[PDB]
């Protein structure tokens, strides 16, 4: 679903309380200086995401604040909020689980990962758990294509998962621990599983192969 029209509700309306903490105003000050003077509207995206890292989602009031301090029309922040998919215009769970289901991950049985989470958490795609701890949605390619299947939970990638591995991650999150990002297969990164096939030699030091003129 995720309609793209806003209707006022008691818990989401222009009078809903939101304001940047005094620390965030300092962060906003540095953000605006990354762009030429007179083009302060270029800070909408980073400032909008900052308003979401403080709150966890973007209420209609939060968008209005971003417009107010950047001197941008409010309708030009609604466009940004609804166009980019990482902006949450409804509350999400404490841990936003995002399962990649594009073809590279599908070929390596990413549906099993999605099935395991639903049975484990007792939810469906697009639903928040009763305790407000988990939100599940499918997403497109997340970059970690060679380490498929993989999921993103908030700001961490968990890769090379199997139906057993993902359920361990949820147990660790449901207790309070911090699961370690990266693959869970034995490998560390995009390197081949059966040992390295390249870069298995002391890399050459400074000034190797430099041309004569330089």
């Amino acid at each position: 679903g995720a309609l793209f029209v806003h209707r006022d509700t008691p818990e989401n309306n222009p009078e809903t309380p939101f304001d940047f903490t005094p620390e965030n105003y300092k962060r906003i000050e540095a953000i605006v200086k990354n762009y030429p003077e007179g083009h302060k509207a270029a800070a909408v995206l980073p400032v909008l995401d900052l308003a979401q890292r403080q709150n966890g989602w973007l209420p209609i009031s939060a968008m209005n604040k971003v417009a107010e301090i950047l001197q941008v029309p409010p309708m030009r922040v609604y466009e940004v909020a609804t166009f980019y998919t990482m902006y949450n215009r409804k509350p999400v769970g404490k841990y936003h689980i995002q399962v990649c289901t594009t073809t590279p991950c599908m070929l390596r049985n990413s549906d099993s990962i999605l099935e395991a989470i639903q049975k484990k958490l007792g939810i469906k795609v697009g639903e928040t758990t009763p305790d407000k701890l988990f939100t599940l949605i499918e997403v497109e390619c997340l970059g970690a294509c060679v380490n498929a299947p993989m999921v993103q939970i908030n700001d961490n990638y968990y890769e090379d998962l199997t139906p057993k591995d993902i359920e361990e991650i949820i147990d660790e999150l449901k207790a309070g621990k911090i699961p370690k990002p990266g693959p869970r297969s034995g490998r560390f990164s995009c390197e081949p599983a059966g040992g390295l096939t390249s870069l298995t030699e002391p890399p050459k030091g400074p000034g190797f192969g430099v041309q004569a003129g330089l």
Partner: protein, 45 residues
């Protein structure tokens, strides 16, 4: 110090907080050179 190629040296990101990126962007503000000026406060001015 001896050449070791069997450990993952990119472990610093295991403990990055929510504000890590914005905190770094705030530290990289005294090194930045002054921005160019369009001549107006905004296109709507």
């Amino acid at each position: 110090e001896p050449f070791d190629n069997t450990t993952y040296k990119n472990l610093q990101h295991h403990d990055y907080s929510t504000y890590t990126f914005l905190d770094l962007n705030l530290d990289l503000s005294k090194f930045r050179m002054p921005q160019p000026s369009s001549g107006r406060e905004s296109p709507r001015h």
